[PDB]
mmCIF file of C-alpha atoms and ligand atoms in Angstrom:
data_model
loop_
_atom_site.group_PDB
_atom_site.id
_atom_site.type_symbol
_atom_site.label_atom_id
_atom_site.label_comp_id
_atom_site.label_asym_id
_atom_site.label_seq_id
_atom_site.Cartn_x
_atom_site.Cartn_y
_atom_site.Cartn_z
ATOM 1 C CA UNK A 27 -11.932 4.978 -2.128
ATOM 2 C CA UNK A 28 -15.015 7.115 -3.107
ATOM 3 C CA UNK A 29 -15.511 9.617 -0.641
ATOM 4 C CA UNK A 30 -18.207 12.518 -0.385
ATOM 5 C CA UNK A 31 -17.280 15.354 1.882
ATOM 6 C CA UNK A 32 -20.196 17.346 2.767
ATOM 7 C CA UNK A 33 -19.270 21.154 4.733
ATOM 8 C CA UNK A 34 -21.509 24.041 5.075
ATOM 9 C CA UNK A 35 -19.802 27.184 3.690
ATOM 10 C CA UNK A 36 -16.604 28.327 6.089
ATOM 11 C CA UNK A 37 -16.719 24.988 8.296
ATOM 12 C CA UNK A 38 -13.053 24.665 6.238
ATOM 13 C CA UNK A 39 -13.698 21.235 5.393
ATOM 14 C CA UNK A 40 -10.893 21.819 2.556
ATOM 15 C CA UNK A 41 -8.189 21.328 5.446
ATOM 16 C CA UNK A 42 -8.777 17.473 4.857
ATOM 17 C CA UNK A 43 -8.725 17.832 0.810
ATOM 18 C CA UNK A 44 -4.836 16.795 0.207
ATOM 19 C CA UNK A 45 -4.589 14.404 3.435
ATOM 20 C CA UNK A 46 -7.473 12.234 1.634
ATOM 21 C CA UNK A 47 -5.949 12.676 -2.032
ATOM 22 C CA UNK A 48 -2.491 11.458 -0.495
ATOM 23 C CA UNK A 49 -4.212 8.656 1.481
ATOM 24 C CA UNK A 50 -5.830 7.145 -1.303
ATOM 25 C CA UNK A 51 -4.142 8.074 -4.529
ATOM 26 C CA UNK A 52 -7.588 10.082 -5.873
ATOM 27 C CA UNK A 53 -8.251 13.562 -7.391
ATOM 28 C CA UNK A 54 -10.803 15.828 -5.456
ATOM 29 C CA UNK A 55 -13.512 16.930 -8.142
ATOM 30 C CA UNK A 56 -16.253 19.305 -7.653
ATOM 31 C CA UNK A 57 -19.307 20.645 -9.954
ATOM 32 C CA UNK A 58 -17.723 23.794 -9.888
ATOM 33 C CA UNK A 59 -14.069 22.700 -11.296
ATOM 34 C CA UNK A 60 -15.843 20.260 -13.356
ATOM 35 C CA UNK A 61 -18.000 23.124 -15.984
ATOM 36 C CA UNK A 62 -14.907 25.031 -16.137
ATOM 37 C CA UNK A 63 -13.215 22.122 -17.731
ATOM 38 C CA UNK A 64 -15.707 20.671 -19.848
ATOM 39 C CA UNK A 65 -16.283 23.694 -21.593
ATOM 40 C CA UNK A 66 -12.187 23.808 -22.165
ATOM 41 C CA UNK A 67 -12.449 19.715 -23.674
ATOM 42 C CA UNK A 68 -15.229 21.000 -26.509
ATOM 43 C CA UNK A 69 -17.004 17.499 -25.653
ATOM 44 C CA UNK A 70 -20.709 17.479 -26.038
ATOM 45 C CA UNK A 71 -21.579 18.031 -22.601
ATOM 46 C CA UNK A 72 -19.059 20.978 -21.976
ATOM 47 C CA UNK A 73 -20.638 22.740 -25.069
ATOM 48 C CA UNK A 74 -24.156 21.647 -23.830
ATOM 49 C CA UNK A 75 -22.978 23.230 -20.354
ATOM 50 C CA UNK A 76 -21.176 26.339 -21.912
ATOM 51 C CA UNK A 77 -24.504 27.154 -23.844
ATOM 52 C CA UNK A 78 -26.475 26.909 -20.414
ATOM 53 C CA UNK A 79 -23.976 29.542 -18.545
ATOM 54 C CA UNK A 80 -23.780 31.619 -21.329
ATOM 55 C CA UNK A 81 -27.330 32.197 -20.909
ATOM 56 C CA UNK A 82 -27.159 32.899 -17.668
ATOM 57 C CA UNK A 83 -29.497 29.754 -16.467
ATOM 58 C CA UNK A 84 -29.584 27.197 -13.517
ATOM 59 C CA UNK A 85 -27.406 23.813 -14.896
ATOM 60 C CA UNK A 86 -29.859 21.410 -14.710
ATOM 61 C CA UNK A 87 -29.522 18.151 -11.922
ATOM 62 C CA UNK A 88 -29.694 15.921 -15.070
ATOM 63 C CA UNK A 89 -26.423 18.277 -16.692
ATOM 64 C CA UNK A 90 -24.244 17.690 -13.355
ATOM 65 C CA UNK A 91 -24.630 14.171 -13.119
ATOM 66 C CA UNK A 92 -24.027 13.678 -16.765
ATOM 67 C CA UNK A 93 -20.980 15.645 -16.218
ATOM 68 C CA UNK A 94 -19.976 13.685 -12.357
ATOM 69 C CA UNK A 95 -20.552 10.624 -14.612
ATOM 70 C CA UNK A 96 -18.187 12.050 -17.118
ATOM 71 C CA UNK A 97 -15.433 12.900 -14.819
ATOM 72 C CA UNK A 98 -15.039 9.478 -12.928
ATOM 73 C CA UNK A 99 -14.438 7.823 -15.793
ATOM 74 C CA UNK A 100 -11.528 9.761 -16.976
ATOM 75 C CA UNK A 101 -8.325 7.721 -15.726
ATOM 76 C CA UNK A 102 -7.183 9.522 -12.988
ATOM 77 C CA UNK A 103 -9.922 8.695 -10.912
ATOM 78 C CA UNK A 104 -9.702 4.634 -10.950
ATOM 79 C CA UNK A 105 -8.449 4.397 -7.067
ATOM 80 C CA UNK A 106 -11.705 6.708 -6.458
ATOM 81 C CA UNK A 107 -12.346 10.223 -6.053
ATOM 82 C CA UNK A 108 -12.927 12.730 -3.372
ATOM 83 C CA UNK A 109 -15.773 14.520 -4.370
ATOM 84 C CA UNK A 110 -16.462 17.743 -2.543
ATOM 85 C CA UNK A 111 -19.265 19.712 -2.054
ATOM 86 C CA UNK A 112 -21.831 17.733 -4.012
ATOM 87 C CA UNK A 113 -24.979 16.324 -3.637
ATOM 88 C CA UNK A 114 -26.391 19.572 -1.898
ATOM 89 C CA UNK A 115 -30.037 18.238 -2.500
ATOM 90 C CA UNK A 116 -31.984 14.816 -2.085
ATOM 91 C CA UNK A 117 -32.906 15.094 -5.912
ATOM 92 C CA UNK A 118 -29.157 15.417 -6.524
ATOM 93 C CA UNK A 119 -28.095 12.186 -4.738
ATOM 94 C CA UNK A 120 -30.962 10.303 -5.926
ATOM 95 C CA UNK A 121 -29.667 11.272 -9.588
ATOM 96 C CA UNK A 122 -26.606 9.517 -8.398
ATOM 97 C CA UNK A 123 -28.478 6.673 -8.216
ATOM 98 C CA UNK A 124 -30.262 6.174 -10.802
ATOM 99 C CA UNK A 125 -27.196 6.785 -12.598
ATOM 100 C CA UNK A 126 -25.436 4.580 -10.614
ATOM 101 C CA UNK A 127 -22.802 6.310 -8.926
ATOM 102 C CA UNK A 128 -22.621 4.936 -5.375
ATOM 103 C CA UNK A 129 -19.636 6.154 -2.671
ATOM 104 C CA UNK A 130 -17.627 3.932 -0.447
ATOM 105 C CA UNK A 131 -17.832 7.260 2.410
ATOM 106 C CA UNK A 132 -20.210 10.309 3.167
ATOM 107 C CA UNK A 133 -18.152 12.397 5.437
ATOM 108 C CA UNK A 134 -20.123 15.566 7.182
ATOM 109 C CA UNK A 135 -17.912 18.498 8.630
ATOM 110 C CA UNK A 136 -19.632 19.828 11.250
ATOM 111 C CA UNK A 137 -18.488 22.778 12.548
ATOM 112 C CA UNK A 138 -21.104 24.790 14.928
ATOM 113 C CA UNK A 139 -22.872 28.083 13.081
ATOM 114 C CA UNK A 140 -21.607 30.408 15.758
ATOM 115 C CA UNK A 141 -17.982 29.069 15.372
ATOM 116 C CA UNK A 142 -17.902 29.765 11.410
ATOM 117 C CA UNK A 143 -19.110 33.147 12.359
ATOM 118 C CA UNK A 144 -16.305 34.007 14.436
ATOM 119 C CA UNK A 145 -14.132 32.781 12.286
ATOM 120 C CA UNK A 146 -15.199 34.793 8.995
ATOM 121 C CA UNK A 147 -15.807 37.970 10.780
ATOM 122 C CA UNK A 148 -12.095 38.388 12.279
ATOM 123 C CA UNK A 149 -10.925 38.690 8.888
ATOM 124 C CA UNK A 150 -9.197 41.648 7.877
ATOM 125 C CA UNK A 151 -7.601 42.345 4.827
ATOM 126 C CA UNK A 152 -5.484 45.008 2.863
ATOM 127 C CA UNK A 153 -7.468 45.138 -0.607
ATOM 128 C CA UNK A 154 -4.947 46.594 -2.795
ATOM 129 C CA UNK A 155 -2.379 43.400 -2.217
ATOM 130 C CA UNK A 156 -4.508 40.364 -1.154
ATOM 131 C CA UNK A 157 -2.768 40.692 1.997
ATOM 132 C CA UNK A 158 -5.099 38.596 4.722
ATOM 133 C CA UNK A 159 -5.253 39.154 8.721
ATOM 134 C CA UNK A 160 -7.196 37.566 11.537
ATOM 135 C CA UNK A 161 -7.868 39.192 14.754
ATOM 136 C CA UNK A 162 -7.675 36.019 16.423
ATOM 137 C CA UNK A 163 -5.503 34.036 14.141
ATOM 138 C CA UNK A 164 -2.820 36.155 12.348
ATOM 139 C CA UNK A 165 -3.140 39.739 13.607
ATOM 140 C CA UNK A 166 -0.927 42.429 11.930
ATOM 141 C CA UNK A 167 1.865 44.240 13.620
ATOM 142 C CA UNK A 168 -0.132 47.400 14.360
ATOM 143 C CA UNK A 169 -3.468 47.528 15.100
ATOM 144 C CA UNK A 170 -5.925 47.619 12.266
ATOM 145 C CA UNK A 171 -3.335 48.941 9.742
ATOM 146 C CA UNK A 172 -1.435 47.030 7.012
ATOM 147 C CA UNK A 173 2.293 45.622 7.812
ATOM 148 C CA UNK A 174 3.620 46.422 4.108
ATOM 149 C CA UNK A 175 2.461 49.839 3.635
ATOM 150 C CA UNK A 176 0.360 50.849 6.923
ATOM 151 C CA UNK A 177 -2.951 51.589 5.030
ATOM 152 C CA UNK A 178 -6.166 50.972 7.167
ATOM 153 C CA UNK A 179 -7.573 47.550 6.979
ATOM 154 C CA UNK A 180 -10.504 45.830 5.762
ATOM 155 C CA UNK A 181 -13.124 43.587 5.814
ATOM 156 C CA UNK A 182 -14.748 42.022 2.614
ATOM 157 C CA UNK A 183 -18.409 42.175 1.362
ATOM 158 C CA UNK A 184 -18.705 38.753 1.666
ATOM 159 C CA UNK A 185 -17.579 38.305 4.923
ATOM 160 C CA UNK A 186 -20.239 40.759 6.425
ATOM 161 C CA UNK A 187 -21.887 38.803 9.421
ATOM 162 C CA UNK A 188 -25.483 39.404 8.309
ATOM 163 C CA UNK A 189 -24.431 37.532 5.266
ATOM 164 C CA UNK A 190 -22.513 34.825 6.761
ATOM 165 C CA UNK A 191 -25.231 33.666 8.785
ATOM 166 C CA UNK A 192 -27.599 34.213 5.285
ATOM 167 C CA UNK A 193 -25.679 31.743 3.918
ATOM 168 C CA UNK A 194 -25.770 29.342 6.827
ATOM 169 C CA UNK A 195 -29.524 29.000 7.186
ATOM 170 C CA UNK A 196 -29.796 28.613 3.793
ATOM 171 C CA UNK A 197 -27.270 25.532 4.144
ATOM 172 C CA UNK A 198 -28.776 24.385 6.653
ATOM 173 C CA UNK A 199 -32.654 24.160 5.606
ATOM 174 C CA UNK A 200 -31.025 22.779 2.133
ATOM 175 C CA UNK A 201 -28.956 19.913 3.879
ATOM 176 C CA UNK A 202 -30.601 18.698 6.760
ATOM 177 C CA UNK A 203 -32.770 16.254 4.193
ATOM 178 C CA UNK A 204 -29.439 15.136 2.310
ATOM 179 C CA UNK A 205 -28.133 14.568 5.675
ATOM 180 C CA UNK A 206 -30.962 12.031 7.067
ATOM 181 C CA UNK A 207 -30.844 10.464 3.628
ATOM 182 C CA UNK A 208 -26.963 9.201 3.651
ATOM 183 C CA UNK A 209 -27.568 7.846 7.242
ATOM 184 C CA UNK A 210 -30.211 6.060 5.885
ATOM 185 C CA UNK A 211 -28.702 4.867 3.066
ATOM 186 C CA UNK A 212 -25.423 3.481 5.417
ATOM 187 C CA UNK A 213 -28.409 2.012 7.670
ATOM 188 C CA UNK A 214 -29.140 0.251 5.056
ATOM 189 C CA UNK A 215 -25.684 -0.685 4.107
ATOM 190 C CA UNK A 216 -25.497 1.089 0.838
ATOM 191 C CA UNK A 217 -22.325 3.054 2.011
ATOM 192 C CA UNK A 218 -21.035 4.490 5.452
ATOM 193 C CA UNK A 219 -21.922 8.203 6.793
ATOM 194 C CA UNK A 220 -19.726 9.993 9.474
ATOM 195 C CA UNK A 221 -20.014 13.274 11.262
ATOM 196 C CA UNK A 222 -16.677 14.634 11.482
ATOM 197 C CA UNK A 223 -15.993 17.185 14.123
ATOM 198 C CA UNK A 224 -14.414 19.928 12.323
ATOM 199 C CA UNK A 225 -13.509 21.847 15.525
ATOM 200 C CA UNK A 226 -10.304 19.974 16.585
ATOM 201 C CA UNK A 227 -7.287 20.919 15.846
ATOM 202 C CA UNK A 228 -6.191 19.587 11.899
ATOM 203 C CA UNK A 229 -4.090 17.039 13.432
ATOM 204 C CA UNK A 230 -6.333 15.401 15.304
ATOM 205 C CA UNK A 231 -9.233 15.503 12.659
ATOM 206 C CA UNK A 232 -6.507 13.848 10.399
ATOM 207 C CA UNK A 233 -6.187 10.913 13.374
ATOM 208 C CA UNK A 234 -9.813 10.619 13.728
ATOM 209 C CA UNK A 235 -10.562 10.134 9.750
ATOM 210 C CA UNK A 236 -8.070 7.772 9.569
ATOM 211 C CA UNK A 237 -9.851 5.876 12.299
ATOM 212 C CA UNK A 238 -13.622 6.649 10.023
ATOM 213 C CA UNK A 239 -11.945 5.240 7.013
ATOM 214 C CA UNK A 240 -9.288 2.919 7.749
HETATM 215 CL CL1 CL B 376 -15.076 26.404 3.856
HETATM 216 CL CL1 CL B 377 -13.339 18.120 -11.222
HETATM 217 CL CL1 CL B 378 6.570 45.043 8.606
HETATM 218 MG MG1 MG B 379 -8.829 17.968 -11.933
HETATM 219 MG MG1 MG B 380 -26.052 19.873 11.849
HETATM 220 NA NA1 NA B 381 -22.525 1.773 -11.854
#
């Protein structure tokens, strides 16, 4: 199976990652994972790619689809792939096809804007050690303070809410397009889109995939 799995950024759409890979047999690949390695393989397109991020510049959309290309055709992706996170853009997925890369499944984790909020700003964590609370989730034994040594808690720069919700509309004004186009293209039969409701609990999401995909 070829599966794209579309999430904005803290929907946790990575709690489905190994249930697909064990379902199918298939590696989950991503841009990201996928210009760390080429650079390691010194083939053409991980030195092209290297040069590129050692400048400091944008990879071009013709670069990552050379390099999805690339990647599928290595053997351990002949039952499929999962790949995650990618097309973000209408000019990214119509790259796909023109290169011909076509998916058997778009799957969309929707999880509401206000819910990935809460989520990200209950975090707490003890810097020094890594060590990760959750007001909500996984509190610590006394309030505010680390279990292991009692120092004050935390909250990381990236998890400020002003930046959270940055990061959403941004997602969201980038996405909405890529969205309409995959229902278009399974209205046309091309492959099949789903809107997966990320807010059940993992178990059930698991049940209800299995029903999207078979
Ligand atoms: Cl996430
Ligand atoms: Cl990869
Ligand atoms: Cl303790
Ligand atoms: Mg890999
Ligand atoms: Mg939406
Ligand atoms: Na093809």
């Amino acid at each position: 199976m070829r599966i794209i799995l579309l999430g904005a950024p803290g929907a946790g759409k990575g709690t489905q990652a190994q249930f697909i890979m064990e379902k199918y047999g298939i590696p989950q690949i991503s841009t990201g994972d996928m210009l760390r390695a080429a650079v390691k393989s010194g083939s053409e397109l991980g030195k092209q790619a290297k040069d590129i991020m050692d400048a400091g510049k944008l990879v071009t959309d013709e670069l990552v689809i050379a390099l999805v290309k690339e990647r599928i055709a290595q053997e351990d992706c002949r039952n499929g792939f999962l790949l995650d996170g990618f097309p973000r853009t209408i000019p990214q997925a119509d790259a796909m096809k023109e290169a011909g890369i076509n998916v058997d499944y778009v799957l969309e984790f929707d999880v509401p804007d206000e819910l990935i909020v809460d989520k990200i700003v209950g975090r707490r964590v003890h810097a020094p050690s890594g060590r990760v609370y959750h007001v909500k989730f996984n509190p610590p034994k006394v309030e505010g303070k680390d279990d292991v040594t009692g120092e004050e808690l935390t909250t990381r720069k990236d998890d400020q809410e002003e930046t959270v919700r940055k990061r959403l509309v941004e997602y969201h004004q980038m996405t909405a397009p890529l969205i309409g186009y995959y229902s278009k293209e399974a209205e046309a039969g091309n492959t099949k889109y789903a809107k997966v409701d990320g807010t059940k609990p993992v178990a059930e999401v698991r049940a209800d995939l299995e029903k999207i995909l078979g």
